Amino acid sequence: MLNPIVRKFQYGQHTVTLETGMMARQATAAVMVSMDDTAVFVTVVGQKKAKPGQDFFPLTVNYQERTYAAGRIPGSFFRREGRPSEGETLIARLIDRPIRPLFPEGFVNEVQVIATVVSVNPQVNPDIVAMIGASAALSLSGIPFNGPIGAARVGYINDQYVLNPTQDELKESKLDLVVAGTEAAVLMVESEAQLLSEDQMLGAVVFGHEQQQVVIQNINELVKEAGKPRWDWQPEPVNEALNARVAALAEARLSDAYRITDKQERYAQVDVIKSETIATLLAEDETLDENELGEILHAIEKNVVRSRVLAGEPRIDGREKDMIRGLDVRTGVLPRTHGSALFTRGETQALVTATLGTARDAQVLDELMGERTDTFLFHYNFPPYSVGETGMVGSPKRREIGHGRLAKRGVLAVMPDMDKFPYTVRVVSEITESNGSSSMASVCGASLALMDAGVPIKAAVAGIAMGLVKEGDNYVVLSDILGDEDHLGDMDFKVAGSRDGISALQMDIKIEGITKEIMQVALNQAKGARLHILGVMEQAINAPRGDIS
Template identity: 65%
Template sequence: MFNKVTKTFQYGQHQVTLETGEIARQASGAVMVSIEDTVVLATVVARKDAKPGQDFFPLTVDYVEKTYAAGKIPGGFFKREGRPSEKETLTSRLIDRPIRPLFPEGYLNEVQIIIHVLSVNPEIDPDIAAMIGASAALCVSGIPFSGPIGAARVGYANGQYILNPTTTQLKTSEMDLVVAGTETAVLMVESEAKQLSEEIMLGAVVYGHDQMKVVIDAIHDLVRDGGKPEVEWTAPAKNEALIARVKELAETNINETYQIKDKVARTAKLKASFQEVYAALAADAAATGIPQPDNVDVGNVLFDIEAKVVRSQILNGEPRIDGRDTRTVRPIAIRTSILPRTHGSALFTRGETQALVVATLGTARDSQKIDALMGEYTDDFMMHYNMPPFATGETGRVGTPKRREIGHGRLAKRALIAALPNPEDFSYSVRLVSEITESNGSSSMASVCGGCLALMDAGVPMKAHVAGIAMGLIKEGGKFAVLSDILGDEDHLGDMDFKVAGTANGITALQMDIKIMGITKEIMQVALAQAKEGRQHILGEMQKAMPHVKTELSDFAPRLITIKINPEKIRDVIGKGGAVIRALTEETGTQIDISDEGIVTIASVDAAAGQEAKRRIEELTASVEVGKTYDGVVLKLLDFGAIVQVMPGKDGLLHISQIANERVNAVADYLKEGQQVRVKVLETDDRGRLKLSMKAAEGAEAAPQ
């Protein structure tokens, strides 16, 4: 019934098993990947034909986590999985990026890849298994694909690289890097690091690529024994007559258009030139009686001409689109504290890319609680990236963030997190929001620069300034050019897009997407060195604009006061049914959080109110010491003495025999309610009740009457 094929291999410290032929047999390709109890099912379905008139490759990748994989039932009313989490979205992008360039040019059949996480070991993140599974499923399906690819996670601790570190190992690792590629080429890198050098980062990429070859060999074996026949597909023949005619009509105009340095003017001229080409071809068709060529085909030819013009200019040493050489960073303008009521803000402009970044400080109560498949955790630093359509002069949908926005936000967060202060030094939760107000390339790196400045403006004691730069690469044969601070068009028409962020001491985040084969270690080395030069320049501009962290918080930011109390006294602060802490927060206007360890955090925009809350908590939790003298207040008179409060919530019995040195016949002759008296604590019984004495207080201090 089943033609099951299984391949098992050792991958670092883990054993990996690939299976096909038993589950999801109606899919074009399906592979189950198991790594030490983490199990994913990757499926691929490809349509037999492309939709007529389609001008793009419709590839979708969906990585789906099922809560049953971790033995959990989903929360919420419906008790089933809802919209994709941030982790699912980011992993879907992680899988998409290295496989997309490996489909042949002209292949426009719809392809859908779905990866289900079926079982999860909290020590093994399913993302590497998902990437391996997607690669294997594509290869066994027989559809046109220049794979397989392998994938590896690389850690770095004690000067050594770690292949596929566990969750526990990553906690002490200085790097979390994921690399994917074919046998001969690296295609994708995604990483965060704790200010590591370019040499260490590049070494990790090369190490991961070398190690993943065992994965590629295993997939080849799986395809040999369990793969489907290759799908017959031939690339559509090029219409040479159309190419020649479009070239004749458009090449000169496109060359002239790319001499215009302003993006808006250039885009308008380009659109007008394209319309002229469409009109001329329509006139040709009317004059000759032959059918008018398809606009999609014409658009593809125009794109190829555009790419050739831009790429040849750069490779021939001519100025780039906006007149710069390959190493120059666009002019930078920085303003901080631009929004009056926010806690921290910065406007970072680099050429035609601009980010307005706002920092907000909150308490532990404002941190994000995440119920992840691999375990619950709390995130004290949130980074959100938004790019509305007006940033590129367009109209469009506004609302739920798209995959790209989530990915860019995570990259900026990775870049900044290594420079944030330690939680014990700065106990605030922080939310950073980057609003892209103009975009012409490198908006995620503008978010890093603006984000760092906004944090410093908010008074967050950053360990160092952090800057980011987006780099590009143009390669033809043996010639190549690395471009610093790329424009949107250079990203679109280039062969490699990589973003590097870091401090003056080293790299904190690296993201690399390579669209072609043949990018060598040497080219990456040149690119990283040039990126460092650009990063140092940007850091210099940032340091000029904001040399130091603001020492004073915004008037509108909460002040945090932290005190340690005896955990046994927590109930005294909370009170019966929360009455005491509720009264405290209402009367002082503060927010009070108490940990099980007795750490009390008081948050208040008004510093005086915070200090008042602190004073009252210290009073509530103070211990009365036997033998010590206190100023007390008479609360109640009794026949045999009085009840005296020595501290809030702490009162004791002042016996009639301890009021004065002479005989006391009536307590009321000596005391009245509300009277302040000086008393000494004689003893406390096993129930915490106090015995007080005015006589002993007088004797101890020998105070004149």
């Protein structure tokens, strides 16, 4: 009837079992991963035909936790799990991040990955088991997928790196890093630390990458034993003639339009060149599609910017590689809030407020592992006017939740201990303008607001968003990347921290070849940026005021 295929291996101090072939045989792949009694059933379904006119890859990742896994009847009024919680959305994004770049270019078929936690050992975290399950299911499915990934969590106990620290071990640890990566490269890093150095935070990434390779190898063996035949998928052919004609008509014009300084005149010249080239081609032949010409023009403009940056020429706004945008800091902007601050970096502006309460205001979360009491609450509001647009107000998308979590990770390391400060603190960050890293501005504003409110924080914290552009052996590390430089980001990293250590690190690498020396250079330039911001910030406020509540 059913013949399940089981693959068991040893992952540090735990045993990982991958079971496939018995459950959900109507999905494109389904696996059940178990790590020391924590079990996560992960399914992937892929459509074999792409809808005509699809321009973006429709990947959905859903993460669900079931209370029956922990042996508890849910405490909701309806006694059923409702919409995904904040943690579930964060874990779904954590699974999403390392697997999007691994689908081939031009793959627009709809893919959905559903990971449901079915058993939970209170000491083994279900998120690494969900990431392993997603990688295994995607590798077994046969959908075009450029390599299995492995995931690992690193901790720092007694000045030693520890693989997959347990919930009891994670209390004494000074680090909590999640590194996901393929056999050849690191893809995703999401880490919170207690003000550690840069070597201490890169060593952990290397350790976790080197310890997750057994997962990759065992998934490879499982796929060899019980994998589906690979999809016969080919990317849509590139219309080389149209690209060549558009290039010969507009490439020199665009390359030379970018040499002028003024932003508005440059935009006008760009639009002019675009209109003339598009019209000329459209008149010559009518079968040409407007959107296809627009995308080919966007692509040529992006290649122009990339070539200029890599060639040493000033950036779009006239800044150099290591230059940080202009900084403005104000405190006490709001009259009747406990603490308030307005932080502006270039065109990224955040209004951050800190509110003090009593212990009854602490948030009680009924998570699978146990009931938790949170006394530091961080909320992140990204309204539509921050980018000059209209839309829905009060709906937090996945990115608006991940950014808030990153900012909270950035500020968590300097928050006062309950004994010294026995009050509940809520920090709310409204992003009034966004043309850069809104989350790093959120971290800076949170530090300023917390000091204005009188919270006895250990030190001031600031963050910087950085990018790296690589071609062959040549690379350029760009500081304070703009909202229009996202394409120019082979490696995108967001480092937060104080003057003496890193408090949060997020890295998303979309290319191969990022060695350890490259990361050393990138995080040293990021240290210099952070220290510049922190020094500018110190002038406005240097110590917490004596205003307790």
